[PDB]
Amino acid sequence: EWQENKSWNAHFTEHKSQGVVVLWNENKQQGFTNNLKRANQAFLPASTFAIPNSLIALDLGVVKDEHQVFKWDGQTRDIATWNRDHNLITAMKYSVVPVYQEFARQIGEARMSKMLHAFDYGNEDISGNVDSFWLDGGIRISATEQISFLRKLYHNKLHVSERSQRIVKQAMLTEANGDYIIRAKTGYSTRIEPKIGWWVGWVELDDNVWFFAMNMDMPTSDGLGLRQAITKEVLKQEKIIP
Amino acid sequence: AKEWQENKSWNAHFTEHKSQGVVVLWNENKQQGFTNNLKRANQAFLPASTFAIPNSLIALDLGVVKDEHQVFKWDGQTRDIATWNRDHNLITAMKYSVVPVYQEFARQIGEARMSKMLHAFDYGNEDISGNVDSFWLDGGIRISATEQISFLRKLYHNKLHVSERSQRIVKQAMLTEANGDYIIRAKTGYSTRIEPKIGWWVGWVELDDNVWFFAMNMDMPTSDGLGLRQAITKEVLKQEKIIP
Ligand SMILES: *C(=O)[C@@H]([C@@H]1N=C(C(=O)O)[C@H](S[C@@H]2CN[C@H](CNS(N)(=O)=O)C2)[C@@H]1C)[C@@H](C)O
Ligand SMILES: *C(=O)[C@@H]([C@@H]1N=C(C(=O)O)[C@H](S[C@@H]2CN[C@H](CNS(N)(=O)=O)C2)[C@@H]1C)[C@@H](C)O
Ligand SMILES: [Cl-]
Ligand SMILES: [Cl-]
């Protein structure tokens, strides 16, 4: 079942914001959200598209492994961490769009369309060329749809190799300590309103996994740390992390 | 290949705690090694719970362990470490150093396959003499800090003669710490059945642009000092500007 817990709206309104958190308790097969409507509204994925793009690139051999180096093209872009050589791990850490656009061009439109359909990722009616559609609004996805996709990835159930799925889950590693492991991907959609932040992923515990997907209003880049901070406040409230 | 560099200033991090030991570092990009004590870096000890790394690789490659979700049920014997008295999988068995799970792996692998695969891994002295389910606690096997690094470099590069999948699963199980600055994959040990009683910590630090392998051991006359395995290692990594 799904349970709506409107008490989590306080974690957004404390920051003069609005958003949705969606949680899924894998052991109990139960979901929770503050806003069932916004949980099911589709937003541009922005940098969260790094997950399916990386899976497809690895499965087709566009990317050999997580050590392959994608050289900087020497064009200075306005995110400083993009202006250097990357591998699949650092490209995900720094959300390096130009690396992902070269992956997409090599995948090509036909194989990209077929794979996203196989993954049941995003809307049926995608539009835009293969290096741009995932930046310019040609694909969108909801927080509940991000959870369903991430559950398939966690269980190695996507229609790509087990190896591809294991490598991308390695690249998603964000935090680990003696209490929990978080595998996740941030996003920040700026090209089309509403400007939003994403954080999608899961928390591994000794005896359970909690999937999460959040998006929130992001009128300026000043608020970007709230993607992780508000999510962690909800996880702490629900006793998932200490 | 390149000369080991000795840095005796690291001894201060041991003597601060009235302790003695060795830290060995390997800079992968530069193919350069560093230690406070070249002699002790080459001294071979029982691996104790550091053996969980090769034991898990062999169990996965032979199909004794299907994957990292397979549950190893508690046998119902109450042991003195409370976290052992519960069901485990390959991830939690490594986190809690659950010897009874690893002893079941070793019995299913058996003496012959265990001896052959440690030979294939070039692991320490390759000697499994003793009980098939305790030789890494009180039998003949011995490995040095430098030998631990040689083994871990092969694992990092998927160069051991087991499947790539087996190597990726064990590296997942070794995950110890991750933040925006670094990832540590590592395994603790504490050898208490045979003198000298020692602590171990072996593994690597992944940075954006390099990997630093480490192997440390130290005298551990009482369980008091077990946190020094990680704390002394991190003081050295901080001194060398590897972590903040
Ligand atoms: C993905 O969604 C986009 C990228 N994701 C970004 C992110 O890191 O969240 C970056 S924005 C980057 C963050 N660090 C720089 C400075 N932040 S600050 N000090 O101004 O608050 C800017 C980028 C948008 C992808 C689609 O571009
Ligand atoms: C592996 O080498 C041995 C195991 N390694 C352990 C470890 O924690 O490093 C456990 S010892 C663990 C720590 N806390 C309990 C002991 N007392 S305390 N709270 O002071 O640390 C249990 C175990 C020895 C394996 C061969 O047994
Ligand atoms: Cl990992
Ligand atoms: Cl063990």
What does this structure look like?
- Chain B: GO terms for molecular function: beta-lactamase activity; penicillin binding.
- Chain B: Keywords: Antibiotic resistance, Hydrolase, Plasmid, Signal.
- Chain B: It holds the Pfam family Transpeptidase.
- The structure is a homodimer.
- By secondary structure, chain A is of the alpha+beta class.
- Chain A has a single domain (1-242), classed as 3-Layer(aba) Sandwich (Beta-lactamase), CATH 3.40.710.
- The first copy, chain A, is 35% helix and 20% strand.
- The first copy, chain A, has ten helices and nine strands.
- A seven-stranded mixed β-sheet of chain A has the order 1-3-2-9-8-7-6, sandwiched between helices. A two-stranded antiparallel sheet of chain A has the order 4-5.
- In chain A, a hairpin with a 4-residue loop joins strand 8 and strand 9.
- In chain A, helix 3 packs across helix 5 (97-107) and helix 3 packs antiparallel against helix 9.
- The radius of gyration of chain A is 17 Å and the shape is globular.
- The interface between A and B is medium-sized, with 15 and 14 residues.
- The structure holds the ligand *C(=O)[C@@H]([C@@H]1N=C(C(=O)O)[C@H](S[C@@H]2CN[C@H](CNS(N)(=O)=O)C2)[C@@H]1C)[C@@H](C)O (2 copies) and chloride ion (CL) (2 copies).
- One chloride ion (CL) binds at residues 170, 173 of chain A.
